[PDB]
Design a protein around this ligand. Structure first.
Ligand code: HEM
Length: 153
């Protein structure tokens, strides 16, 4: 289900992301919070931000965007061989933050939306299919770790 060619498509669009990690991460989180506002409830100090301009001007939200894309990039670059990177993320998101897999689906949809909006010429059907499979693998593997930790979300 991911060939080496599909991993190259994932990593090619990822290189485009890496031209501006902060701006992509801001836009991904803003998209997630506008599409699925219940996710904001997990963030004590984004949940009171009243407007898109306030979210874009928040240095903390920008830093979070970088933290999320740095961890995800490190995972994608392993082309599936991501146990050591993914295990601690599962641990925190299951046991501390309590993030259900459906919220990982929502942020995956936000990732695809922003990548396509910013890079349509590098993110056609085949590259989208490859990224969807890579994100599905990430979510499948995190869900298995969730269960191993006793969290069934
Ligand atoms: C691609 C998916 C995601 C990645 C790679 C990611 C990555 C991270 C990283 C690296 C951290 C800091 C270290 C840690 O606590 O593990 C973190 C913190 C956290 N994440 Fe995620 N995350 C993802 C999705 C989500 C989603 C969808 C939510 C909420 C709807 C969420 C909620 C949180 C919370 C509440 C924290 C703690 C924030 C703080 O205390 O500053 N995460 N995440």
């Amino acid at each position: 289900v991911l060939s080496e060619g599909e991993w190259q498509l994932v990593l090619h669009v990822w290189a485009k992301v890496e031209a501006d990690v902060a701006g992509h991460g801001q836009d991904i989180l803003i998209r997630l919070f506008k599409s699925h506002p219940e996710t904001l409830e997990k963030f004590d100090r984004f949940k009171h931000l009243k407007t898109e301009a306030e979210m874009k001007a928040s240095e903390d939200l920008k830093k979070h965007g970088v933290t999320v894309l740095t961890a995800l990039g490190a995972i994608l670059k392993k082309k599936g061989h991501h146990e050591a990177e993914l295990k601690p993320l599962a641990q925190s998101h299951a046991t501390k933050h309590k993030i259900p897999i459906k919220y990982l689906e929502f942020i995956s949809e936000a990732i695809i939306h922003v990548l396509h909006s910013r890079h349509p010429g590098d993110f056609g059907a085949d590259a989208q299919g490859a990224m969807n499979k890579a994100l599905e693998l990430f979510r499948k593997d995190i869900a298995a770790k969730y269960k191993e930790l006793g969290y069934q979300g």
